[PDB]
Amino acid sequence: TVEAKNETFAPQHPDQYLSWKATSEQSERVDALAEDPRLVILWAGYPFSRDYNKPRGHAFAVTDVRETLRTGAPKNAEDGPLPMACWSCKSPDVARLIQKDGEDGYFHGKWARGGPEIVNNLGCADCHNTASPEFAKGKPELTLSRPYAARAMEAIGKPFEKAGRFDQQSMVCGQCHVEYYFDGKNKAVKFPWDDGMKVENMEQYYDKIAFSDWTNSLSKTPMLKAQHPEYETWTAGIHGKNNVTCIDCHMPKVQNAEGKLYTDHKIGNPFDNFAQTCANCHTQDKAALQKVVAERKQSINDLKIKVEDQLVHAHFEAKAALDAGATEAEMKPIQDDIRHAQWRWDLAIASHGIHMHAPEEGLRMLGTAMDKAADARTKLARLLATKGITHEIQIPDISTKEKAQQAIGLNMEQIKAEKQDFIKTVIPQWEEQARKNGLLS
Amino acid sequence: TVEAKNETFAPQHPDQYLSWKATSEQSERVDALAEDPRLVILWAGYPFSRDYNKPRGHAFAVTDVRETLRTGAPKNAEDGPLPMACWSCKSPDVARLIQKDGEDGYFHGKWARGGPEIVNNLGCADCHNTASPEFAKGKPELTLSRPYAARAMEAIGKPFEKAGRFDQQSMVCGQCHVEYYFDGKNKAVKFPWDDGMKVENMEQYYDKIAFSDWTNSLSKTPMLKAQHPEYETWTAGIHGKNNVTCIDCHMPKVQNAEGKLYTDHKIGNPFDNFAQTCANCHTQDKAALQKVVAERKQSINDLKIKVEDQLVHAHFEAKAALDAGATEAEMKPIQDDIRHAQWRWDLAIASHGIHMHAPEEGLRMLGTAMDKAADARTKLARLLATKGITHEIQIPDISTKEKAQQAIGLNMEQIKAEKQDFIKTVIPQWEEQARKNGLLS
Ligand code: HEC
Numbered sequence: 011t012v013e014a015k016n017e018t019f020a021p022q023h024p025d026q027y028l029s030w031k032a033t034s035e036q037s038e039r040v041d042a043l044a045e046d047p048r049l050v051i052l053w054a055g056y057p058f059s060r061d062y063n064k065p066r067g068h069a070f071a072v073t074d075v076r077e078t079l080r081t082g083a084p085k086n087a088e089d090g091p092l093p094m095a096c097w098s099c100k101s102p103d104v105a106r107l108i109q110k111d112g113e114d115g116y117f118h119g120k121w122a123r124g125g126p127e128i129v130n131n132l133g134c135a136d137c138h139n140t141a142s143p144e145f146a147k148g149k150p151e152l153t154l155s156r157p158y159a160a161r162a163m164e165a166i167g168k169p170f171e172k173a174g175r176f177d178q179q180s181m182v183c184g185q186c187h188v189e190y191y192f193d194g195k196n197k198a199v200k201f202p203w204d205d206g207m208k209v210e211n212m213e214q215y216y217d218k219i220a221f222s223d224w225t226n227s228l229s230k231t232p233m234l235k236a237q238h239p240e241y242e243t244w245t246a247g248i249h250g251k252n253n254v255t256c257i258d259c260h261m262p263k264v265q266n267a268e269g270k271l272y273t274d275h276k277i278g279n280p281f282d283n284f285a286q287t288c289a290n291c292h293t294q295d296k297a298a299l300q301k302v303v304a305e306r307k308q309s310i311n312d313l314k315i316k317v318e319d320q321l322v323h324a325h326f327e328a329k330a331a332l333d334a335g336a337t338e339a340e341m342k343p344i345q346d347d348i349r350h351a352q353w354r355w356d357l358a359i360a361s362h363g364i365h366m367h368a369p370e371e372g373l374r375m376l377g378t379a380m381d382k383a384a385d386a387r388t389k390l391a392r393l394l395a396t397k398g399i400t401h402e403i404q405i406p407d408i409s410t411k412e413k414a415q416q417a418i419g420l421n422m423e424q425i426k427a428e429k430q431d432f433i434k435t436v437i438p439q440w441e442e443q444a445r446k447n448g449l450l451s
Numbered sequence: 452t453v454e455a456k457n458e459t460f461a462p463q464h465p466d467q468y469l470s471w472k473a474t475s476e477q478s479e480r481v482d483a484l485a486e487d488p489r490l491v492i493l494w495a496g497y498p499f500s501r502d503y504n505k506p507r508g509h510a511f512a513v514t515d516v517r518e519t520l521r522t523g524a525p526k527n528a529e530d531g532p533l534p535m536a537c538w539s540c541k542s543p544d545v546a547r548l549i550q551k552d553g554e555d556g557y558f559h560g561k562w563a564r565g566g567p568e569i570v571n572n573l574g575c576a577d578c579h580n581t582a583s584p585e586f587a588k589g590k591p592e593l594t595l596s597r598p599y600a601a602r603a604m605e606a607i608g609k610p611f612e613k614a615g616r617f618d619q620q621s622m623v624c625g626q627c628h629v630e631y632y633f634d635g636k637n638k639a640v641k642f643p644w645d646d647g648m649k650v651e652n653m654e655q656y657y658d659k660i661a662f663s664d665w666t667n668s669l670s671k672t673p674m675l676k677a678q679h680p681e682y683e684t685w686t687a688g689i690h691g692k693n694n695v696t697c698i699d700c701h702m703p704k705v706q707n708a709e710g711k712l713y714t715d716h717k718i719g720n721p722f723d724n725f726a727q728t729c730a731n732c733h734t735q736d737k738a739a740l741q742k743v744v745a746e747r748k749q750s751i752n753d754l755k756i757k758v759e760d761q762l763v764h765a766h767f768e769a770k771a772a773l774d775a776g777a778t779e780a781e782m783k784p785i786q787d788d789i790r791h792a793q794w795r796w797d798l799a800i801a802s803h804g805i806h807m808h809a810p811e812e813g814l815r816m817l818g819t820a821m822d823k824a825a826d827a828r829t830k831l832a833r834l835l836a837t838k839g840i841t842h843e844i845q846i847p848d849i850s851t852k853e854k855a856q857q858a859i860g861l862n863m864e865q866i867k868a869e870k871q872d873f874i875k876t877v878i879p880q881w882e883e884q885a886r887k888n889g890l891l892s
Pocket residue numbers: 061062063064065066074075078080081092095096097098099185186187188190199238360361362
């Protein structure tokens with residue numbers, strides 16, 4: 011069965027083990043709502059409007075899902091707003107339970123449930139078939155420990171077991187680094203890849219099944235949320251197209267002291283080891299590549315803010331149209347535009363690596379998002395007119411996260427206090443039960 | 452001393468002379484307004500709404516400016532819609548005239564004035580200091596024969612005379628393959644590069660001097676026209692950033708029958724000699740690089756059309772607001788938006804090579820265009836409402852060039868009749884006068 015206790019592997023594999031543990035150095039947790047308060051409006055009614063940080067080291071996955079406001083402060087195993095599926099991409103204990111109880115049995119019930127079962131840091135069994143006798147010998151034996159990922163990979167015509175070593179490499183990361191949704195009453199993780207991985211494929215896919223992630227509480231639009239589409243966007247970009255794998259840049263072959271070759275498990279910023287990553291294929295100075303990348307980053311940033319500003323006006327303008335007496339049939343075509351505009355925006359920048367992995371596709375999707383936002387705001391102006399409104403809709407102060415959160419009716423003081431008490435008192439009980447059950451060293 | 456009679460150099464320089472002359476093989480003249488009737492509406496009130504074709508071989512430069520509807524049917528040297536400056540990038544006689552009469556004397560007057568003076572095909576003295584003794588020996592002796600280009604290069608901190616061989620290679624192309632405007636009552640060519648070559652730099656530059664190319668007959672917006680900014684956009688793109696020169700792809704070094712190395716002067720599509728072009732730096736095969744380029748071309752085209760459709764609507768809605776009583780002060784803010792939107796769009800796709808030279812910059816520009824086009828149509832929906840118009844403005848059928856042109860008031864048959872007559876009777880008289888005067892063998 012799966013060995014979720016990572017430290018079990020330290021003596022046999024010092025080089026991988028030590029460099030894997032070192033992601034605990036990537037510890038800064040940057041508040042992205044604070045940096046961009048518009049996110050709060052666009053995600054109004056959804057948990058991302060309460061708390062959304064930039065990623066950090068794999069070592070912090072378990073603690074971050076515990077600590078994010080998104081998972082709240084459940085007082086028992088059937089409480090809290092979120093289901094078991096929130097653990098899915100955070101811990102090899104997921105592979106353990108999936109193997110122990112079956113996939114269906116793993117996904118059943120609330121996040122709170124897994125509290126005392128999912129306790130080991132994202133680790134060896136997530137990516138490796140550790141039970142294989144070859145793993146002991148120092149062979150990677152890569153595997154997809156997540157059945158939902160195995161299925162998604164077949165669905166794009168790339169079954170894992172039939173793929174070469176190098177395709178498999180990126181697929182391992184594509185177990186988590188993807189856009190997904192919770193399918194069914196049991197909220198199983200599903201990748202919406204049935205029709206392809208492009209924004210248009212997914213848009214039409216989500217529309218066919220009339221899926222919606224939540225209802226924007228300002229405009230009452232049935233929204234889609236995107237998440238960190240690295241696999242999909244990497245596939246579209248020029249590096250992907252040339253089979254430069256996630257590993258080529260994020261997990262370089264390096265030497266130990268006795269000169270032995272090993273894969274660097276300290277997954278982080280490839281530029282921190284330029285000599286072993288880009289320099290491997292590129293003759294350019296580090297500073298020159300960093301500057302090209304910084305420039306795409308700013309290009310996308312500037313454009314992304316313009317689309318967001320439009321979407322902010324659209325949400326508040328739809329709120330106005332609702333208050334002035336707009337009926338459901340009158341809102342519908344506006345709401346379709348907003349749903350679409352925002353999906354395209356969200357998928358365009360939900361991956362923080364887009365300006366590197368596929369800057370041109372990032373840019374393209376934003377442009378198509380603007381086209382729909384224009385359609386939404388044009389329709390809205392005409393709808394407001396029919397209700398006797400011909401002036402610009404005024405927008406409350408959203409210059410800080412705090413003001414944006416207050417403006418959509420969040421009681422943060424209370425939301426935060428309830429989470430702090432959950433963190434202090436519940437987490438140690440969970441860890442104490444896990445140790446008792448032999449789950450946690 | 453400037454020799455505009457190109458055949459003089461044939462004996463001494465058979466390899467360059469023969470391939471140069473060969474651009475005459477690239478003879479298809481594809482009508483771009485026919486491919487895309489939307490352009491007719493965007494350019495309403497401007498010669499481009501009459502006639503605009505995709506580029507062909509250098510060999511046809513003199514014929515094309517003569518034959519385009521944009522230059523009209525002048526019956527004498529003072530007549531015609533357009534000025535001397537239209538010759539500036541079509542013939543080495545321009546260098547002859549500028550050296551002989553000076554830059555101001557070259558620019559003074561009407562395009563008609565030049566008919567019997569500007570008669571040799573784009574050629575040697577455009578790019579080469581042919582007077583140099585080192586030139587007879589087979590050394591390129593590249594030069595900027597166009598002084599307004601020399602000033603423009605100096606303006607962006609790349610003075611021709613201080614530049615290496617490879618900077619200079621693209622600079623000779625940057626004498627013509629640039630965005631430009633006509634400066635002063637005499638209409639001298641100027642590259643709007645003073646504040647930089649980014650779309651934002653030129654928009655600010657143009658707004659700073661309140662410049663307008665023309666007024667859109669539909670919306671009465673003061674408009675900017677973009678023209679083929681290959682130098683600016685090649686600069687912004689990844690190749691340009693690595694000093695891959697226009698020459699590396701469009702003018703490869705080849706070998707003559709006797710194994711002698713020379714520059715291929717047949718300037719055309721680099722894919723036609725992949726082995727000598729791209730294969731020099733890339734290991735990917737021809738079909739694979741072609742399909743990447745074809746993808747980017749499709750991406751941009753899709754976004755392009757979305758932006759153009761918004762702009763078309765913007766112009767007809769502005770027309771309707773005008774027909775419905777809107778004042779100048781009411782229109783001003785709307786016209787600013789349209790002005791900026793279409794400038795950003797026009798500079799993004801005025802280069803037919805943008806999908807290859809700098810896909811990501813093309814796409815980034817179309818996104819920013821979409822942003823102002825959205826503000827414009829939102830402003831217009833409100834203004835229209837204040838005149839009691841709350842329905843969508845209907846657009847005439849513009850599915851073909853012929854119907855678009857008809858819709859903006861053009862009398863295409865008359866325009867064509869006048870142009871045909873002018874080509875049949877006037878051109879020959881020009882050529883005869885130039886022979887008479889030894890300017891044309
Ligand atoms: C199928 C993969 C997957 C699932 C399911 C998933 N995550 Fe994530 N999560 C990721 C990846 C990949 C990152 C880091 C990349 C990023 O944030 O862009 C991440 C980052 C995070 C972070 C740290 C950054 C932040 O947003 O503050 C938190 C907290 C988090 N997830 C909570 C959750 C919650 C709550 C759920 C249940 C709704 C969930 N995750 C479900 C893959 C997943």
